[PDB]
Amino acid sequence: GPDETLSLLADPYRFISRQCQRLGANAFESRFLLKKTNCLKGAKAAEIFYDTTRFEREGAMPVAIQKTLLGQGGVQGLDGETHRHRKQMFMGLMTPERVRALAQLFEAEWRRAVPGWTRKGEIVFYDELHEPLTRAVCAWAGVPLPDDEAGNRAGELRALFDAAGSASPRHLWSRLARRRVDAWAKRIIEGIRAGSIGSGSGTAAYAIAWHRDRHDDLLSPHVAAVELVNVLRPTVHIAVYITFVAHALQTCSGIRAALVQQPDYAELFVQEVRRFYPFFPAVVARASQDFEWEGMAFPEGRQVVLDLYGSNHDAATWADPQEFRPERFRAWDEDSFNFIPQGGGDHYLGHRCPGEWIVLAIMKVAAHLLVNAMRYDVPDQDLSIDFARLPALPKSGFVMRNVHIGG
C-alpha cells in the first residue's frame, strides 16, 4: 500500500475511524513514514494493545514527539519491570488528599486571575488558563516559581503541546521550549539533591528527585527533569479540557441547568467531556512477537496505533456516540478498555495515564466555577472545533467578555 502520512496529518483525530467505517472493520493495515502500521479501534482492539506480552513501547515513539512533547528517557519509553517500577513513582503522587490539594490550589489561582480578566474586557479563555494551571501545579509539585516568571514558564509548558504539531517557526519554538523546560526542571532536581531547595516530602519534585531505580540509583538529573515535566506539562494542558467544558455549556442545551440543579451531574458531565471531545488522537506501540488477530497479521516489530478518539466514538460500545449526553455514564460498567481518553488497561501494569484523578478533579472545579461563581458574556464567534489542528480546539479559542466573579 501507499504512504498515508499526509492524509493522517490532515485529519489526525478522525482518519482511522473513517477508514474503518469505509472498510466495515476495526483494523486496517497502512503506512506512515517508512513504517507499515496496523491501525486499531474499539474496546477489543484496546484490550490486545494493552497486553504487554504482545506489545512494547521501547523505540515506538517517533523522535519528533520525543524532542518536544515527551522528552527522552521518561516513563513512556519503558517496558517490563523497569516500566512498572518507574510507573509506581507516578502513582504514589495520586492519593485522594494530594489530588484534592491540587484542585484547591487551582481554584485559588483561577479566582486570583479573574480580576486580571475583568480589567481586560475581552479574553481568549483558552490563552488564559495556562498560567493559573502552571502556578497551581508548580506550588503543588514543590517547584519554586517566582511571580514574574510564571507567565513565561506557562508559555514554555504550553508550547510543548500547542506548538508541537505545527509547521513554520512553530516547531522550532517547541524544540526550544523543550530545551528550556528540561534545563529548568533539571536545576530544580539538582537544587533539591544539594539541599538548597526545600520541597516537601509529599511533593512530586521531591519524590522524583529522590526516586531510586531497581538498582538503588538516583535517576540521572536529565531523566529526573523529564519525569518532572511529565507532571508539569500535562497538568497545564488541562486547559484544553477546561476550554471544552465552557464549549459544552455553551452549545449543548440543558447542560447548564442540569449542572446547577442535579448534584450528581458534575461527574457524569466531566466524563462525557472526556468521551466526546478530541484530545490525544492515538497511542503507539510495537508488536513484540508474531501473532495474528481478527485475521490481521501482527509480525514482530510492526508499528501499531490505537485510535483513542475513534474508540470513544464507537457505536458498538455507545449506541449514539455522536451525541453529547452526560446521562450515558449512569449505565457505564467502568470497563477499562471501552473508554480510553487517557489510555486503557491497568494503571500499574501498563501505560495508562496516572493523571486521570487530577484531570477529573480539575475539570470538576472548572464546571463549578463556570456555573456557580463566574459570569461572562459569549459574543458571536466561530466555536466549531478545528479538527485539522493538534490539539483540536474551538476556532475562536472561546472568547469571553465582561468577566467577573464578585457579583
- Residues that bind ligand HEM in the complex, under the rule CB under 6 A: 75-76, 87, 90, 230-231, 234-235, 237-238, 241, 279-280, 283, 341-343, 351-355, 358-359
**Shortest distance, position 69 Cβ to ligand HEM, whole Å:** 10
Residues 341 and 358: their CA atoms lie apart, in Å, by: 14
Shortest reach from residue 343's CB to ligand HEM, in Å: 3
CA distance 332 to 318: 9
353 annotated to bind ligand? yes
Determine if residue 50 is labeled as part of a ligand binding site.
yes
252 is in an annotated binding site: no
Residue 132, CA atoms < 13 Å, CB-side half-sphere: 27
Pairing of strands 122-124, 296-298: unpaired
280 appears as a binding residue in the annotation: yes
- 3 state SS of 275: helix
Tell me whether residue 138 or residue 403 sits nearer to ligand HEM (CB atom): 138
| Minimum CB distance to ligand HEM, residue 128 (Å) | 17
Interatomic CA distance for residues 393 and 391, integer angstroms? 6
Cell of 127: 490563552
DSSP labels, 358-383: HHHHHHHHHHHHHHHT-EEE--S---
* Closest to ligand HEM by CB, 282 or 371: 282
Of 173 and 357, nearer to ligand HEM (C-beta) is: 357
Name beta bridge partners: 36.
31
Q: Which cell numbers in the block locate residue 314?
A: 464507537
User: Measured from the CB atom, is 241 or 337 closer to ligand HEM?
Assistant: 241
Contact criterion met (CB below 8 Å) for 248 and 324: yes
* Least distance in angstroms from the C-beta of 327 to ligand HEM: 23
The CB-of-244 to ligand HEM minimum distance in angstroms stands at 10
How is residue 321 written as a grid cell?
456516540
Instruction: State the cell numbers at 379.
Output: 459574543
Q: Residue 392 is which amino acid? A: A
Is residue 283 within a helix (H) or strand (E), and if so which, with residue range? strand 282-287
The nearer residue to ligand HEM, 141 or 266, going by C-beta atoms, is 141
**Residue 19 annotated as binding?**
no
Strands (E), 49-150: 55-56, 122-124
Output the smallest distance, CB 252 to ligand HEM, in A. Answer: 20
Nearer to ligand HEM, 279 or 337 (CB): 279
Residue 67: CB atoms within 10 A of its CB come to: 17
Nearer to ligand HEM, 197 or 270 (CB): 270
Least distance (Å) between residue 382 CB and ligand HEM: 23
Across-strand partners of 298?
291
Contact (Cβ atoms closer than 8 angstroms) between residue 12 and residue 269: no
For 106-169, strand residue ranges (E) read 122-124
Residue 178 assigned ligand-binding role: no
Residues 6+ apart with CB under 8 A from 194: none
Q: CA–CA separation, 281 vs 307, rounded Å?
A: 6
Q: How far is the CB of 311 from ligand HEM (least distance, A)?
A: 11
Take residue 218 and report the three cell numbers written for it. 538516583
User: Please, which residue, 43 or 75, has the CB nearer to ligand HEM?
Assistant: 75
Sequence ranges of the binding site for heme b = 50, 57, 83, 87, 280, 342, 351, 353
Sequence ranges of the binding site = 50, 57, 83, 87, 280, 342, 351, 353
Sequence ranges of the binding site for heme = 353
